[PDB]
Every structure is written in C-alpha cells, then in structure tokens.
Amino acid sequence: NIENGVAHIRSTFNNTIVTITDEFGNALSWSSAGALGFKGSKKSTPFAAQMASETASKSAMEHGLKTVEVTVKGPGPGRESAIRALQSAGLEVTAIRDVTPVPHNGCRPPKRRR
Amino acid sequence: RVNVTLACTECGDRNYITTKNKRNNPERIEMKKYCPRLNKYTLHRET
Amino acid sequence: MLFLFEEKPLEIENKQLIKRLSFHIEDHEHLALIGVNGIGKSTLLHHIHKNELIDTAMMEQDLSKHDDIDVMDYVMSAYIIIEGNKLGLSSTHFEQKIGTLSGGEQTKVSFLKVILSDAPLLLIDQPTNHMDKEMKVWLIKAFKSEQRAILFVSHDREFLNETPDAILELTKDGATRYSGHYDDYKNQKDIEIETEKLKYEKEQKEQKAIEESIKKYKEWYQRAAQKASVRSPYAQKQLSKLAKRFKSKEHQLNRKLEESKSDNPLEENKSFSIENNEFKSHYLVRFENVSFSYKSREIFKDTYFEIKRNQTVIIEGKNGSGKSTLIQLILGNLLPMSGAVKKHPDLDIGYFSQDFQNLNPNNSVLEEVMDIENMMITDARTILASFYFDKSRMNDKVRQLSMGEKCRLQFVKLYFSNPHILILDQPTNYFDISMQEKIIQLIQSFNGAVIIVSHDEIFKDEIRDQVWKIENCKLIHENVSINTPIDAESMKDELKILEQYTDERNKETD
RNA sequence: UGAUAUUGAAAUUCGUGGCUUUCUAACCCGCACCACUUAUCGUGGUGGGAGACAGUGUCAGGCGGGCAGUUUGA
RNA sequence: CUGGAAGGUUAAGAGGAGUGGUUAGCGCGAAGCUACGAAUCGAAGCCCCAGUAAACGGCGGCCGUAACUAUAACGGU
RNA sequence: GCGGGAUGGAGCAGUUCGGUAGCUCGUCGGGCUCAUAACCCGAAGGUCGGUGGUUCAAAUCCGCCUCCCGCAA
Ligand SMILES: Nc1ncnc2c1ncn2[C@@H]1O[C@H](COP(=O)(O)OP(=O)(O)OP(=O)(O)O)[C@@H](O)[C@H]1O
Ligand SMILES: Nc1ncnc2c1ncn2[C@@H]1O[C@H](COP(=O)(O)OP(=O)(O)OP(=O)(O)O)[C@@H](O)[C@H]1O
Ligand SMILES: [Mg+2]
Ligand SMILES: [Mg+2]
C-alpha cells in the first residue's frame, strides 16, 4: 500500500503524541501517552513517549511504509526517546526538523504563574 | 373477601352465588348442593 | 407472525398474578423476557407450553422433580442416536442419574434435549445458569446460528447485550416491548424515570403554593370575624366576600389532587448486614493429604487447603471440577482416604448452597426460619420483612416458591446464624439485576472470612484476595508465580532510558 | 404538519418498492420587452427565473380565551 | 421563547395472518360474495437536552459567640 | 382560640401509610508540638416530648398531657 510517510512527534510537558501520515498529510495512524493509559507525571516522561511512538509505527508498519523523515514540535522531555523508538521498530529515518511555532511578534501571552 | 359462583360438575354450569375470603380459602371451593336440572344433589366447583 | 397472545389474565394456579397481559412473537426472532424475581417469568413460559398452541421446547430451570430418571432416557423423553458426536457441550456421560450431575452439567443436558426437539418455538429459561466462562462464550455463538424463534429469560446483562432482538419487560401491568439490546432498553428506562419525578416534584410545588395562599386567607378571616359587628350588613358582606376568596381556591386545590395523582414509590435504599464473632485464632480449616472419589471419579488426590482468620477465598475451575464437593468436605462428607480434614473445634458456619438442600420442602416460610434454636416470632417475622416478604407470604410451602425467592430465603437464615465464615456457593446466580447489587454490598460489609464460588467476572474482580484453583486433581494458589515470570531483562532495557536526563533534553537542539 | 389528486421524464443508489439527485415540456412569477392601446388593469406573444416544488380540493394529527355557547348545591 | 445528530411514544393512509357468515360437495367445508381484522411501515407535536430575565416571574430558617451590660465583626447547621 | 412544632450537646433527615436508630458539628481519652489551634487514632452519649391504646411488630397509626413558636386575646 503506502510508502514514505512522515512522523509528527508533538511533545508537551504533559502528554506526547505521534501521528504518522503519508506525504500528503493523510493520517495513517496515531497514538500517544495518555491513550496507553498513563496518568499524570507518568504521562509526560520519556518512557511513555517510547511506548507511544511504537504502538503507532507498528500499526502503520503494517501498510508497508518504511521511511519517514520526522518533524518535531514542542519543548518536550520525551521528544528524543521517540526517535529511538521509531528507528528501532524498523522504519529508517531520513532527516529531521524542529518545526515549532515562532511569532515574529504577534499576539500576547498569558500571565505567568505565581 | 370476594364473590364466587358455584357451577355444577356434571349438569354443566351456574346454580348458586356465594362469598369467600381468598386469604383463608385460596383454592376453589367444593360443596354438594341441589342441581335442579338433574333433580339431584351433586358437587359444585367454584367457577 | 408466529404467535399472538390475546389479552387474558395470567395466573399459575389458584392465585392470579397479572391481568391484561398480551404480546406477539414474530418468526425467526430471539426475544428476551426480563423482569423482577417472583413476577411470573417462568409461569408464563409454562402456560405457552401446556395450554397454548403450536408445539414448543420448554427447557426448565430446576430439574428437581425428575432427579432419579436415568440420563440418556431423559434426553429421549420425546421419542441411530446422534448424541456421542454432539459432545460440543462436553457433557460427561449418560449412565448416571440426573440428580447426580454437577449443578451446571445439567444445564447442558437440558439444553441438549431442547435443541434436538425440532419444534417451531423454543421456550428457554435462564440458560446461562451455572455455566463457565468458556461454556458461556460458546452458546453466544450457538444462539446466533438457528433460524428458529426463541423466548428466553436471562437477567444477565452481559449475555443480554449480544443475543436478543427485542426485550419483553413484565411488570404486573403487562409486557412492554423494547427494541435492541440491554443497553438500548436501559437508556429509555432512564428517560422514563426522570419524567415521573420531575412530574411529581412539580405537583408538590404546585399544591403547596395553593395551601399557603389558602392558609393566608384564613388568618385574615378569623381576625376580621371578631372585629365585625354582627349588626352591620356592610361589614358582614365584606366578610362573606373574603370567604369566597379561599373557598374557590380550595376548589382549585381539590381538582389538582383528584385529577393529578402519581408517586415515586420504588424509593427505598435500605441494605442488609451480618455480624461475625471475631474468631481470635489463626487457622479456620485445613486439609492433610485429603482424597475423595465418586465411585469411579477421582476428584481430589492428596492435597492441602487452608483458610486463616479474616480472609476471602475465591475457588475457581470449571464445570465438574469439584467446587461444590469441596464445600461439602468442610461441613461433612467423611473422606475415603485418611485425609483428616482438620477443622477448628469452635466454628460457626453460614452455608449458601447451589441446590436448596438447606431448605426443608413441605415447610411454610414462617415455620422454617423459626426452626432455629431460640428465635422468637416478632424478631423472626420482622427480619423476614425487609427481605421483601410482604406479611402475607407467611403461609406458603417452601416447595412452591420462586427461584429468586428461596435464594433470598437462605439469606434470611444467614442473618440469624452469626457465623465465623460465610460459605457462599453461587450467591448471585438466581438474583435479578437489582438484587445483585444489594448482596454484593452485603458480602463486602461482612468483617469475617468467606469462601466464594462464582462464575461472574465483574463480582470476583475487585475482591480478589486469595484464589485457589483445581487444575488436575489438586488445589493451587495465587502465590505460584511459575506461570508467567516478569522476565527481568529490564536491567538491560532501563539503561538506555536512564540517560535522557531532564537537562540533557534542555540541550541538544534538533 | 403528513397522505392523496392536479403530476411528468432519466439516472445513481439499497431493498418490483422506497430514498436522494438531475431534466424539462404541466403549474407559478405584485418580471423585462412588444402588440391590442389614448392604459402602473387585463388578455396574448417573446426572453429570463423558478419547477413536478409551490399554490389549490378532499382526508388526518397538533396548537388554538383569538372568538363563541354555557355550568359554577341545598 | 429560541436552537437541537439521534432514540422513545403517537393520525390518516399503505399492508392484509388470521377469525365469522353463507353453501357446491361429502358435521366436515372449494371457490365466490360477505362481517371484520393483527404484525409491520408512517409528520409535526410531546418526552428528553442546551441557551435566554430592560422575557413571565423569584430574591431563606434555627443555634452559639467579645476585659461592665447589651449587641455580635466571628463560628455550626 | 386557630396554625407549625418536640429524633444523643447544636442543627436536621426518617412519619404520608408500621419491619436491622441515621448525617454534619461538637464532647471525652490518647498522639503530634517548646505550647495552643489545625491534623491523625479510639470511644461515649438515643424513653424518638410524657402517659395509655392498636398490632406478630410503633420514631411512624389513635386518643390525653405539659412545653416552644407565630398570628391574633
Ligand atoms: N403451585 C403453586 N400454587 C400457588 N402459587 C404458586 C405455585 N407455584 C408458584 N406459585 C407462585 O407463582 C409465582 C411465580 O413466580 P415465578 O417463579 O414465575 O417468578 P420468576 O420470574 O421465575 O422469578 P425468578 O426467576 O427470579 O424466580 C410465585 O410468586 C409463587 O408464589
Ligand atoms: N453422587 C454422585 N455420584 C457420582 N458422581 C458424582 C456425584 N455427585 C457429583 N458427582 C460428580 O462429581 C463431579 C463434580 O461435582 P460437583 O458438585 O463438584 O460439580 P461442581 O464443580 O459444583 O459444578 P458447578 O461448578 O457447575 O456447580 C461431577 O462431574 C459429577 O459427575
Ligand atoms: Mg422461575
Ligand atoms: Mg456445584
């Protein structure tokens, strides 16, 4: 079926999410730390981002994609463990990118917490 | 405490009308009374 | 249109149960018939069998009257023989009696006789009665196989979610047909209970406001009737005009009451309890290389078994393993081997049996509970109520009660037997959906020890403390971690994840 | 608010029946131009728009102090 | 009053398994004509859910507590 | 005179058609603290206003009685 997608890792300080698409943004399969049933402060950590990044690939492994070129987003504790989960499960990374949103000074941000 | 009808067992059907308490006699009552079609005492079941 | 039930009163016997009962049953349809315990779900099934038209099947749910009939001629009660190759049920053998089977091995020698009957409509009772988790996942695949019409009584809300095409809910008002599974029935019965309490809460708040306006007119009146001269026609006339004010809002109040009348009557959240005797020792019972055998069958070889103070034991296995015969060794069965079932000399026991061999048939309800040692009549009749015995079921022979009742009657004898342990054998099996919760709280609010034998997963799932089991001829435990080790190679695997620090992430931009 | 008559055509669709589409010949336009014609009426012709809907008849259900006829002891 | 994907309950109409009448035949009952008639299909509304008060409307009891007494800023329900 | 009451110390469900005496706060005794409050553990306290009746069974239903409350004497 499909070959050559891209992986969209999306880690925040709670919860990472990995979604694999084709190269037309077509959403082969997704998964993520809280789906596996991790509760908070575990939900966040580098173990769970390497579960979640391999309950994905192995369930779109199965469409014969095998080459992905990742793009990364967020700050994240568990960003980079999700790219030895990937390249572990047989997918052969091509080359990566940190596409995070950066205002060229736009809207105003929330207060900060005391 | 209800109303009951005594029907003949062979001469066929209703002859008498009585009353009963269905907490003390929950079954069907049995009494020998005069069937005037047979001209003879027979047995009467409550309908 | 396979069958119509024209409107007629239902009644098993001299007593009348329902009036104005009617329903239809199509062809090729499986129709569930759910309802409360003691309402008449089984008497209605007997009616269609005996007194009705087209021939049927009528798989009963007691099999107690016929207990010495040799099996393999009970199966041939209707009639080279296609039975040996029909052991998909895994029925043991056809040389025993039929009162000598397991409790759940005769719920599939009556399901065998029902499928091989070749009738248009099959009248089935409980049929997931007593069955395992594997023999109950097999007939879910069997009921979805035959093009005949079925009309069964289930009250099992896991079986009821796949099999039925509609649900027939007996109420004592008649049968109200629903469509879909149990979850579609349940949703609409919830929307139907909101409207009756919003409608009741809205009649109380409309009738209390008319009482308070009425009461205010009357405080004005008796204060004005002492001030008014009896020899003044103006002041009297204002007095009779004030009475018209409240006399006509009493007529508005009397047309709301004699016209707007309902109740929220099924609102009593009471619950039961039992109190133990605080054993004060370590071991309750014990086995010492015990063995047993039913004349050819070797149930237990030399095994060990123990229950300590304040424990909860859950015995497992399958149909025929020996659960209800292990519970017999604890009270008395006199082992053929030495064995020497080692029991404490000061034990009280509360026994709940699969077959009602505790209860004395041909014995009224009131005079059976009163058979205990020093029970009085007030505290007996008063505990007999609160178990829903409405002070008129006092003179009924135990031989002619329901199945849900008399599973509730051996719980009203447990209350008057303050035990050290409760030996419950299938305690939530004949109970309807609403009573399975009132006795799951009871088993949990008992501060003693209990041995539970049960086949439903969502009752023995949150109470799992100790779990023995009967695999070959011997009991096992849950401290046998021989089945599945954790395979501690994590030492090699939680060393890569050790190096993603909290500050290593801070560096190493991507 | 439904069924049914005026009321037709071709296709896709899932069960000979329905659903939804599309087409136009019926019906509709307090819509432009041209005649009758001195005419902001009407009728006829011609382009456009909409279209088997709408409007209209029969039958059915909801709502209905907007409006009627009445009852509201001795 | 407004707005709700569905689900339940409901009309006329569509549908016509069955039950009665009569009688060519031989107390049974073929056609035909007749008195009926169930299952299923069938819209608003209503149930149910959210919003709206310069919409209609509504805006609480008892108890204890302070360096005079009395009150109670404070507390319980 | 008519209305509404009385259920451990305070405030309240439960009565409406009789069936295993309840909820929050407080009181008592230990712990924690240099000490107190807060927090943690364990217990006590019930004629269901008084007094008779009905019933297998009364906080529940039926009379009588003394208190508290509000209008109005
Ligand atoms: N021989 C009899 N004479 C009089 N009454 C009887 C007789 N046999 C049974 N009954 C009564 O008929 C009722 C039938 O209840 P039934 O057994 O049908 O309930 P059920 O639907 O089977 O409930 P469950 O399945 O929970 O037992 C009972 O209340 C019982 O008192
Ligand atoms: N009186 C008897 N004579 C001979 N064999 C018997 C007798 N009673 C029971 N058995 C046999 O013993 C075996 C176990 O019976 P038991 O009562 O333990 O069943 P069970 O485990 O309780 O079944 P379930 O769990 O379904 O109730 C059965 O296979 C049965 O054939
Ligand atoms: Mg039954
Ligand atoms: Mg058994």
mmCIF file of N, CA and C in Angstrom, chain C residues 96-152:
data_model
loop_
_atom_site.group_PDB
_atom_site.id
_atom_site.type_symbol
_atom_site.label_atom_id
_atom_site.label_comp_id
_atom_site.label_asym_id
_atom_site.label_seq_id
_atom_site.Cartn_x
_atom_site.Cartn_y
_atom_site.Cartn_z
ATOM 1 N N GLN C 96 -25.208 -41.923 34.528
ATOM 2 C CA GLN C 96 -25.527 -41.511 35.883
ATOM 3 C C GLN C 96 -27.032 -41.339 36.038
ATOM 4 N N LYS C 97 -27.442 -40.862 37.204
ATOM 5 C CA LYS C 97 -28.778 -40.311 37.359
ATOM 6 C C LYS C 97 -28.763 -38.907 36.770
ATOM 7 N N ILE C 98 -29.823 -38.138 37.001
ATOM 8 C CA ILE C 98 -29.858 -36.743 36.592
ATOM 9 C C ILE C 98 -29.946 -35.807 37.778
ATOM 10 N N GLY C 99 -30.029 -36.341 38.989
ATOM 11 C CA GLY C 99 -29.907 -35.538 40.186
ATOM 12 C C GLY C 99 -28.525 -35.713 40.769
ATOM 13 N N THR C 100 -27.679 -36.433 40.037
ATOM 14 C CA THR C 100 -26.315 -36.717 40.448
ATOM 15 C C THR C 100 -25.288 -35.962 39.623
ATOM 16 N N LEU C 101 -25.725 -35.080 38.735
ATOM 17 C CA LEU C 101 -24.823 -34.305 37.900
ATOM 18 C C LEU C 101 -24.288 -33.124 38.693
ATOM 19 N N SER C 102 -23.341 -32.418 38.089
ATOM 20 C CA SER C 102 -22.966 -31.114 38.606
ATOM 21 C C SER C 102 -24.162 -30.178 38.535
ATOM 22 N N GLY C 103 -24.083 -29.074 39.271
ATOM 23 C CA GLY C 103 -25.133 -28.079 39.174
ATOM 24 C C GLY C 103 -25.221 -27.457 37.797
ATOM 25 N N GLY C 104 -24.099 -27.384 37.087
ATOM 26 C CA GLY C 104 -24.060 -26.753 35.788
ATOM 27 C C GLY C 104 -23.817 -27.733 34.667
ATOM 28 N N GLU C 105 -23.750 -29.018 34.998
ATOM 29 C CA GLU C 105 -23.707 -30.065 33.989
ATOM 30 C C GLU C 105 -25.089 -30.537 33.585
ATOM 31 N N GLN C 106 -26.119 -30.175 34.339
ATOM 32 C CA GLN C 106 -27.489 -30.471 33.961
ATOM 33 C C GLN C 106 -28.189 -29.276 33.341
ATOM 34 N N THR C 107 -27.526 -28.128 33.272
ATOM 35 C CA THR C 107 -27.988 -27.024 32.449
ATOM 36 C C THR C 107 -27.449 -27.108 31.036
ATOM 37 N N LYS C 108 -26.828 -28.229 30.676
ATOM 38 C CA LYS C 108 -26.469 -28.508 29.299
ATOM 39 C C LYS C 108 -26.787 -29.938 28.899
ATOM 40 N N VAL C 109 -27.458 -30.703 29.761
ATOM 41 C CA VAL C 109 -28.205 -31.876 29.323
ATOM 42 C C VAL C 109 -29.688 -31.576 29.216
ATOM 43 N N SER C 110 -30.116 -30.370 29.586
ATOM 44 C CA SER C 110 -31.450 -29.890 29.263
ATOM 45 C C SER C 110 -31.425 -28.919 28.099
ATOM 46 N N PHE C 111 -30.263 -28.332 27.819
ATOM 47 C CA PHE C 111 -30.052 -27.581 26.591
ATOM 48 C C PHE C 111 -29.778 -28.492 25.408
ATOM 49 N N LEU C 112 -29.296 -29.707 25.656
ATOM 50 C CA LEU C 112 -29.172 -30.680 24.580
ATOM 51 C C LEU C 112 -30.541 -31.195 24.162
ATOM 52 N N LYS C 113 -31.400 -31.500 25.135
ATOM 53 C CA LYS C 113 -32.733 -32.001 24.828
ATOM 54 C C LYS C 113 -33.631 -30.936 24.220
ATOM 55 N N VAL C 114 -33.267 -29.660 24.341
ATOM 56 C CA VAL C 114 -34.100 -28.606 23.778
ATOM 57 C C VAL C 114 -33.738 -28.349 22.326
ATOM 58 N N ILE C 115 -32.470 -28.515 21.957
ATOM 59 C CA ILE C 115 -32.073 -28.214 20.588
ATOM 60 C C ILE C 115 -32.452 -29.348 19.649
ATOM 61 N N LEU C 116 -32.503 -30.580 20.146
ATOM 62 C CA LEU C 116 -32.820 -31.739 19.327
ATOM 63 C C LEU C 116 -34.305 -32.070 19.326
ATOM 64 N N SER C 117 -35.168 -31.087 19.572
ATOM 65 C CA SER C 117 -36.598 -31.334 19.693
ATOM 66 C C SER C 117 -37.373 -31.041 18.419
ATOM 67 N N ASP C 118 -36.872 -30.147 17.567
ATOM 68 C CA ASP C 118 -37.475 -29.852 16.267
ATOM 69 C C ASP C 118 -38.916 -29.354 16.432
ATOM 70 N N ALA C 119 -39.026 -28.204 17.077
ATOM 71 C CA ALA C 119 -40.287 -27.502 17.249
ATOM 72 C C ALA C 119 -40.124 -26.071 16.771
ATOM 73 N N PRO C 120 -41.220 -25.404 16.437
ATOM 74 C CA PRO C 120 -41.121 -24.043 15.896
ATOM 75 C C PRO C 120 -40.610 -23.023 16.903
ATOM 76 N N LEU C 121 -41.146 -23.032 18.119
ATOM 77 C CA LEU C 121 -40.795 -22.052 19.135
ATOM 78 C C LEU C 121 -40.109 -22.756 20.295
ATOM 79 N N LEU C 122 -38.967 -22.226 20.720
ATOM 80 C CA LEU C 122 -38.205 -22.778 21.831
ATOM 81 C C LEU C 122 -38.432 -21.928 23.073
ATOM 82 N N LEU C 123 -38.992 -22.531 24.113
ATOM 83 C CA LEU C 123 -39.226 -21.852 25.380
ATOM 84 C C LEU C 123 -38.069 -22.189 26.309
ATOM 85 N N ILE C 124 -37.151 -21.251 26.486
ATOM 86 C CA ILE C 124 -35.956 -21.483 27.281
ATOM 87 C C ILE C 124 -36.010 -20.616 28.528
ATOM 88 N N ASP C 125 -35.654 -21.208 29.658
ATOM 89 C CA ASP C 125 -35.380 -20.482 30.889
ATOM 90 C C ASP C 125 -33.995 -19.868 30.790
ATOM 91 N N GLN C 126 -33.342 -19.675 31.925
ATOM 92 C CA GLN C 126 -32.153 -18.916 32.311
ATOM 93 C C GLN C 126 -30.879 -19.009 31.455
ATOM 94 N N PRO C 127 -30.854 -19.721 30.326
ATOM 95 C CA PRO C 127 -29.863 -20.774 30.066
ATOM 96 C C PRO C 127 -28.400 -20.537 30.415
ATOM 97 N N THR C 128 -27.961 -19.320 30.726
ATOM 98 C CA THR C 128 -26.601 -19.149 31.229
ATOM 99 C C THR C 128 -26.465 -19.546 32.693
ATOM 100 N N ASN C 129 -27.435 -20.294 33.203
ATOM 101 C CA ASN C 129 -27.421 -20.798 34.564
ATOM 102 C C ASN C 129 -26.214 -21.697 34.799
ATOM 103 N N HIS C 130 -25.417 -21.365 35.812
ATOM 104 C CA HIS C 130 -24.352 -22.208 36.348
ATOM 105 C C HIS C 130 -23.171 -22.393 35.409
ATOM 106 N N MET C 131 -23.202 -21.824 34.215
ATOM 107 C CA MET C 131 -22.200 -22.171 33.224
ATOM 108 C C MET C 131 -20.901 -21.408 33.459
ATOM 109 N N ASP C 132 -19.846 -21.878 32.802
ATOM 110 C CA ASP C 132 -18.496 -21.373 32.999
ATOM 111 C C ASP C 132 -18.324 -20.070 32.234
ATOM 112 N N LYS C 133 -17.082 -19.613 32.113
ATOM 113 C CA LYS C 133 -16.781 -18.523 31.201
ATOM 114 C C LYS C 133 -16.447 -19.012 29.802
ATOM 115 N N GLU C 134 -16.215 -20.310 29.631
ATOM 116 C CA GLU C 134 -15.987 -20.851 28.301
ATOM 117 C C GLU C 134 -17.232 -21.481 27.704
ATOM 118 N N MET C 135 -18.039 -22.164 28.511
ATOM 119 C CA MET C 135 -19.304 -22.681 28.014
ATOM 120 C C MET C 135 -20.354 -21.591 27.879
ATOM 121 N N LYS C 136 -20.095 -20.407 28.422
ATOM 122 C CA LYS C 136 -20.962 -19.253 28.243
ATOM 123 C C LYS C 136 -20.508 -18.353 27.104
ATOM 124 N N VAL C 137 -19.282 -18.526 26.611
ATOM 125 C CA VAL C 137 -18.842 -17.871 25.387
ATOM 126 C C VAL C 137 -19.051 -18.768 24.177
ATOM 127 N N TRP C 138 -19.578 -19.970 24.381
ATOM 128 C CA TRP C 138 -19.827 -20.896 23.289
ATOM 129 C C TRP C 138 -21.259 -20.820 22.781
ATOM 130 N N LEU C 139 -22.236 -20.716 23.679
ATOM 131 C CA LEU C 139 -23.615 -20.631 23.224
ATOM 132 C C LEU C 139 -24.005 -19.232 22.781
ATOM 133 N N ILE C 140 -23.174 -18.224 23.044
ATOM 134 C CA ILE C 140 -23.366 -16.942 22.376
ATOM 135 C C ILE C 140 -23.171 -17.114 20.879
ATOM 136 N N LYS C 141 -22.244 -17.986 20.496
ATOM 137 C CA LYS C 141 -22.030 -18.370 19.111
ATOM 138 C C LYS C 141 -23.038 -19.402 18.633
ATOM 139 N N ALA C 142 -23.775 -20.032 19.546
ATOM 140 C CA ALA C 142 -24.778 -21.021 19.174
ATOM 141 C C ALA C 142 -26.150 -20.401 18.956
ATOM 142 N N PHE C 143 -26.565 -19.470 19.821
ATOM 143 C CA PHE C 143 -27.834 -18.787 19.590
ATOM 144 C C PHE C 143 -27.813 -17.960 18.316
ATOM 145 N N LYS C 144 -26.643 -17.522 17.863
ATOM 146 C CA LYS C 144 -26.583 -16.868 16.558
ATOM 147 C C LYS C 144 -26.368 -17.865 15.435
ATOM 148 N N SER C 145 -27.118 -18.966 15.421
ATOM 149 C CA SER C 145 -26.936 -19.973 14.381
ATOM 150 C C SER C 145 -28.220 -20.578 13.844
ATOM 151 N N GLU C 146 -29.321 -20.577 14.589
ATOM 152 C CA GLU C 146 -30.525 -21.287 14.186
ATOM 153 C C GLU C 146 -31.613 -20.301 13.795
ATOM 154 N N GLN C 147 -32.380 -20.662 12.772
ATOM 155 C CA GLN C 147 -33.442 -19.813 12.267
ATOM 156 C C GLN C 147 -34.769 -20.046 12.979
ATOM 157 N N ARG C 148 -34.742 -20.584 14.191
ATOM 158 C CA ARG C 148 -35.955 -20.759 14.972
ATOM 159 C C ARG C 148 -36.204 -19.547 15.860
ATOM 160 N N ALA C 149 -37.413 -19.479 16.404
ATOM 161 C CA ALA C 149 -37.789 -18.414 17.320
ATOM 162 C C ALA C 149 -37.553 -18.864 18.754
ATOM 163 N N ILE C 150 -36.951 -17.990 19.555
ATOM 164 C CA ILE C 150 -36.667 -18.281 20.951
ATOM 165 C C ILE C 150 -37.331 -17.227 21.820
ATOM 166 N N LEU C 151 -37.704 -17.630 23.028
ATOM 167 C CA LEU C 151 -38.298 -16.740 24.022
ATOM 168 C C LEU C 151 -37.717 -17.145 25.371
ATOM 169 N N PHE C 152 -36.682 -16.444 25.825
ATOM 170 C CA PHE C 152 -35.910 -16.890 26.974
ATOM 171 C C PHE C 152 -35.910 -15.851 28.086
#
